[PDB]
Amino acid sequence: GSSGSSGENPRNVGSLDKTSKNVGTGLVGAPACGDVMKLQIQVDEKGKIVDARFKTFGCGSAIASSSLATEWVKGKTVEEALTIKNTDIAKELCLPPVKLHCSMLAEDAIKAALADYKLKQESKSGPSSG
Ligand SMILES: [Zn+2]
Hints:
130 residues; alpha+beta; Sufe protein. Chain: A; three-stranded antiparallel β-sheet; 4 helices; 3 strands; binds zinc ion; mitochondrion
């Protein structure tokens, strides 16, 4: 419910150097539920995900979907992740139709990661700094 409890600490939650390029950054939260899913994966020279970190803030459904998602990107390549869909996730966690926002949240995070990382590969410098 609204009153978020403090406990059941997550696992493997440690954002990566967002100041680098080899590691993309994907942050996707929920406007209604009010969540903050910060995903970050480190891509090697070959283009394979060697490191993956997820950080969810809000409802559990989000923390779970992520923890599981970020675990699927590990060992896989940026290309593979792009294939990863939310439908499967929702089923894996077996979340209700009310906590769907989370399911999609995971996928959105994954892509944002690889994508953002690619943007730097295609454009070293640009008019935007952010
Ligand atoms: Zn939520």
